[PDB]
Amino acid sequence: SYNYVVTAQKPTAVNGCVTGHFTSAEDLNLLIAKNTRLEIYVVTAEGLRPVKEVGMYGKIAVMELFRPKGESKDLLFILTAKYNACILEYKQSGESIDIITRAHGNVQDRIGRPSETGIIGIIDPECRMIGLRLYDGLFKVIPLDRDNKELKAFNIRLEELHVIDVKFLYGCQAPTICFVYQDPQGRHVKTYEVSLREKEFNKGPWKQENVEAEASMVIAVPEPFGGAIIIGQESITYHNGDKYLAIAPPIIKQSTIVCHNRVDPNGSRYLLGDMEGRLFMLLLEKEEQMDGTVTLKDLRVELLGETSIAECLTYLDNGVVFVGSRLGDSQLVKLNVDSNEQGSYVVAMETFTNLGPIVDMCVVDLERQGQGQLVTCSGAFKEGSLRIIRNGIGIHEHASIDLPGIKGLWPLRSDPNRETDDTLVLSFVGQTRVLMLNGEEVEETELMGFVDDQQTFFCGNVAHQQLIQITSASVRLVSQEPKALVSEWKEPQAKNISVASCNSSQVVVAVGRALYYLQIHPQELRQISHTEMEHEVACLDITPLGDSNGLSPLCAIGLWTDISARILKLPSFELLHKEMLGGEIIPRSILMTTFESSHYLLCALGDGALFYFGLNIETGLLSDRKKVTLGTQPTVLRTFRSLSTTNVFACSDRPTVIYSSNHKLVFSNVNLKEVNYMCPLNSDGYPDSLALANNSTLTIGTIDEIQKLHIRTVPLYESPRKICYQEVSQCFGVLSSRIEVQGTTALRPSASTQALSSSVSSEEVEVHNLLIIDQHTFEVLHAHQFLQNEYALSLVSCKLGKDPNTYFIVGTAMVYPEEAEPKQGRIVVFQYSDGKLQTVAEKEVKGAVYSMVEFNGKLLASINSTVRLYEWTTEKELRTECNHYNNIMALYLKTKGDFILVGDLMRSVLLLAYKPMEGNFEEIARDFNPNWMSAVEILDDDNFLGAENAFNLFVCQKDSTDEERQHLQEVGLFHLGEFVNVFCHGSLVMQTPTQGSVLFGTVNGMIGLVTSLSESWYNLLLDMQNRLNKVIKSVGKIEHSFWRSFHTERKTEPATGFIDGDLIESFLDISRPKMQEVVANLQYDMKREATADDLIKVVEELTRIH
């Protein structure tokens, strides 16, 4: 098996968050862990400024900042889920930012079952040690000597086997842990000192205490309080020596508090977040003492308001809180001293997309044909949603004029008072036209000073309240009031101008090979200098960059013949830098531009190639050449603003926006047909807009947010579970569940209680529903509620037998507390007609209906340990045809032709065939290796894909004996690092090295793709990986091969049959010399030594598949 796996959407769920001074001594930073990704921000009064985002070869399990004695700057400790430990430092060497690994090592033990309650990692306030709870009964200590670069550790026996939480205390002479543990006698809090000298615990400073039965979190309180707060379900207690204070506030009893964060450095106030998204303030009241110590007088809890359900909370000063969510969108909120109308102190400032968990999804061509969109069931509880995801950036067209032959567009302010454009100047072969803008009206008009009988190459507002028009014949300077020609420049023999560039006070024009530099003065075009280039000029730019006061010391130029992009000094025209771009196709557009504070040269060729380089605006040096391909026609580049950010629109057959993300250039398709020319337009009637032209038409519209994927959110206010599309009804079916309390009563309104119409089947509880949702408005048209204690598990939309209706079919389970698994459930066939669901037929079965699939006009269903095929009879009932029994728990089905792939709870996958001339199933083959499955997919007749609970993928094949024949072989293995809930065939790209397309959705909201490769392609890419791994410096010095090794509690093996597309794609981001190392000696097709250029082309083809 040869497979390739790549990220289409990175994990969005927030697994943890910390604050401190990491980037510099005086920066306040927010660090966010999104599984495999670490995001670093500087906190401002403006908000969060992104400075650096890195990938780890690992799932981040522990992330803590700490400050070694007498240092100005925090270091970062990370532990991965595979027990990779590192200490990281942030270093900025001028422009370049580097994460350096100061220490690393793997801290796994040989014997050890991972603690069921997870990895805990803590660091003592005096930075003497890191403490890790990895396994029950052991506490691992890493001394923080500067010498301990390998992070060598020792284990201490911990008598208490079941630790709930642990922290290091402040204000202690020896490092001291405080922890809650559980035994038969209940829950207790205890302390121990940790002796480095003895490598053992010593007696803690205070005696143990019994605590609440559901005590779950330990907070170490800084000086001057010291001590610990213990949070439980109905109590909050403070402990410190012969000091004990407890409160039992009813207000917290409704929902478990699951996260905390310190507001005040001295511990006077904490935030607390619960499972329903309530946000509390915990206040510690001080009492003075004669000896000048400070003790705790009392504790209070106050309800502040509501946030997203928080996985973590981080106070960012000035009343600002970052709410990191796993189950909904993350937020920035503000806390105010005074409450609002409805009584909340919490006001939301910003919302960040989280797709996670993705519990189901499907692919549908909603709008066009051939343009797939992903529709997910996302989130949980009050955060549950549908998310609709599609590639590319949209334009909202607001005007359309038929007007062929446009050769350029320029906006103009004809009134020197008003700030908005009021004029659009259009060029045509040998002619110019001026459109005036009065509101939404676009009237043809003249404009005194400008000529209409020459083609315009540039026109604009310029210095000293003047306008400029540059044509093939001359440069014309025009006064604003009144409009009159005040100056006109011509070449000495009045030869044609061939190329024009202009800013507010400078002009460079070309005449064949000649260049002329003019300055714009009051009533004067002043000729400053001229030169003769070695070849004919193709293109020019003099865009001023940086702190430049609108003046460029640089001229960028592209030439014929040598195909060079050059940087020249003005006024002398001295050559500062030359780059030969190769080939025999001339540069067509060149642009100096700034993205996220870094300066670049862009240069586009007529064949669709785009080169880009770092530009030093001081020396004129170009560096770090990169090349993408943006189409096959000449590309024309032009800056525009939207949402207070400068970007570049690339006009071609493939219109593109160029922008920056994490200080790397990014290229995103615009969803339009061919655009030939554009300009920004910001007029009264068309504010913050774009004017667009093709061969026949002028358009004016606004642009969506600049990003790779557009996401629409449909709030449900309850948990979505499964989704299916029903084309004939133009709706989705969505299974959903809401929580109600002890009959039962609801916590808030939600999709299933707010449908247009409703039907019903004739502690906290789940109430399950089938929602019918309109595909255009996403309005809830109908909700059908299932029986009390009925859980809806599976859903399909299909036709059966000879019946022409399409039905929604739901499989359920009746859930009773004492049952190990369900012994009762239903299959229900519904028809959606006239705005309601009618129940057409039912069938009681003796188990949970985990999975259903349409199979050759029949209904395949898995019921507990049985796989069953039903026929749909002429009297509209389901009738069993055949059964398969050899499963533990058949959770997952997929089919292809007569083949059925079965995913088991614990015995991996199994391949059935229906035998149409015997009316029964045959077991073809089974994977005899145990695996705890989460999802399955058929890649093709011979290849079966599985995902399992320890975040691995594998691929099974038949072994091309007869006892031998029924053994599936695991021929592919890969540690993905995500939990796959759903696989589905399809693509987000409009319909090569790869064949097939399978998308997957995950708990962290990551979306991935799996596709197939030939042996040949695999071998090349495998070889590339090995070379890439030798040159790339990895954060924490984790080996890529270690990261991607298949890993469960049973077995660890190198990955095989799987290319890591994220790694391959990173090839485009290394330095050109590194690309040479990577390239040196490797075959490529009959055969030859491959070049860096060859590989850039290949990797580009591979980015196109998502």
Ligand SMILES: COc1ccc(-c2nc([C@H]3CCNC3)no2)cc1
């Ligand atoms: C195992 O524990 C440790 C603790 C601290 C360091 C360390 N401190 C530093 C300082 C000096 C220059 N940069 C910050 N660089 O590494 C290394 C390993």
